[PDB]
């Protein structure tokens, strides 16, 4: 299982500083949706330039014009781009076409999807590399939020998947046991007084 | 009925040039989702600065962290921001809270929703100023695409709504008859060799 850092910050400066401190402990560096909307595609280019041998994940969360959004993100340096599972099949298909053209990949973010396992199988057929069993910050804030719902969906999906939903060192084992290909950590890393140590500790928990 | 131009061009330079040519004929200037992801929030600020006398619509298509995305868009100069209807109710609520705090508004984009009429009523009950009966570019590219489906949903929901999806001079009358408070024109304007003339014609079609 790989470790992915979700840089859900608001400036390129902040993203670069964080990436510099945790890069050595992660396999994938994600530029969050708010970060991309804040700075534009240049943040993707800057991070890839500073970490050329790391997998750069652009969380576009594309909802329409799949081929176009995927293409511009890939051209900007992204190795992986996200398209929402809620998007039309043709939108996901378009993003996949762009991914094939660049020998890169599309990750379908299943955030907000009620039938995650079912949708996962459907988008896998469209060409997604893997799907993200994702619970956003607003969903995580709801009382009673349980990470096991995402893990259960991932197991039933039978599609390569990543898990994003407030993952911490304590839950890394459960995420890996569910068969996740990637464990995503956001707040556990950027919200810590010592981001570098947080990333290192998350990495150490991986079997 | 008001006229909104959806500037989905990919550069701030091109967006400002287009805005300057059509501002006189429109009530709302929209910065499209791909444009915001390409250039970042700076494009919202640049457009509002050049057109303080126009309602600036930031098509964020927020899917998570409703309050956060609404906040940064409003801070950048947007008067209205979009949140996806497929987002969690709490995400829409978060955006609505930010809008209330800034004395601005949230528009819920119903793109990709099968039963737009029902969701329209649900999100209006969450505080949306109005909903956008929206059909994306990928959906419109499918043979047989019909605009009347969006109008039907708008008429049925009985909630303030706008229409976006291939709107042209020929369909303006139908959009207005359906009761739309705003008609959104994208390609009909920015795809024209003469955007000014295109916008002028669209405006002339409004009763
Ligand atoms: Cl590197
Ligand atoms: Mg993400
Ligand atoms: Mg738009």
Curated annotation (Swiss-Prot), chains A, B:
GO molecular function, one term: orotidine-5'-phosphate decarboxylase activity
Keywords: Carbohydrate metabolism, Lyase, One-carbon metabolism
Database matches in SUPFAM superfamilies: Ribulose-phoshate binding barrel
Reactions catalysed: D-ribulose 5-phosphate + formaldehyde = D-arabino-hex-3-ulose 6-phosphate
Pfam families the UniProt entry points to: OMPdecase
Pathway: One-carbon metabolism; formaldehyde assimilation via RuMP pathway; D-fructose 6-phosphate from D-ribulose 5-phosphate and formaldehyde: step 1/2
InterPro entries tied to this protein: 3-hexulose-6-phosphate_synth, Aldolase_TIM, HPS/KGPDC, OMPdeCOase_dom, RibuloseP-bd_barrel
Any Gene Ontology biological process: 'de novo' pyrimidine nucleobase biosynthetic process
The UniProt record lists the keyword Cell cycle: no
UniProt keyword Zinc, yes or no: no
EC number: 4.1.2.43
Expression triggers: By methanol or methylamine.
Family stated for the protein in its record: Belongs to the HPS/KGPDC family. HPS subfamily.
Entries under NCBIfam families matching the protein: RuMP_HxlA (TIGR03128)
Name listed for the protein in its UniProt record: 3-hexulose-6-phosphate synthase
Source organism (scientific name): Mycobacterium gastri
């Amino acid at each position: 299982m790989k470790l992915q850092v979700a840089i859900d910050l608001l400036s390129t400066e902040a993203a670069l500083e964080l990436a510099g401190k945790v890069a050595e402990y992660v396999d994938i560096i994600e530029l969050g949706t708010p970060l991309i909307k804040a700075e534009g595609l240049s943040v993707i280019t800057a991070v890839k330039k500073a970490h050329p041998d790391k997998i750069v994940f652009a969380d576009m969360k594309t909802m329409d014009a799949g081929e176009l959004e995927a293409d511009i993100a890939f051209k900007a340096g992204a190795d992986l781009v996200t398209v929402l599972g809620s998007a039309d099949d043709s939108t996901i298909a378009g993003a996949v076409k762009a991914a094939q053209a660049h020998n890169k990949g599309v990750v379908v973010d299943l955030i907000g999807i009620e039938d995650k396992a079912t949708r996962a199988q459907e988008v896998r057929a469209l060409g997604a590399k893997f799907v993200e069993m994702h619970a956003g910050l607003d969903e995580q804030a709801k009382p009673g939020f349980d990470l096991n719902g995402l893990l259960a969906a991932g197991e039933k999906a039978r599609v390569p998947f990543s898990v994003a939903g407030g993952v911490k060192v304590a839950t890394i084992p459960a995420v890996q046991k569910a068969g996740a290909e990637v464990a995503v950590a956001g707040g556990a890393i950027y919200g810590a007084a010592d981001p570098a140590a947080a990333a290192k500790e998350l990495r150490a928990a991986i079997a």
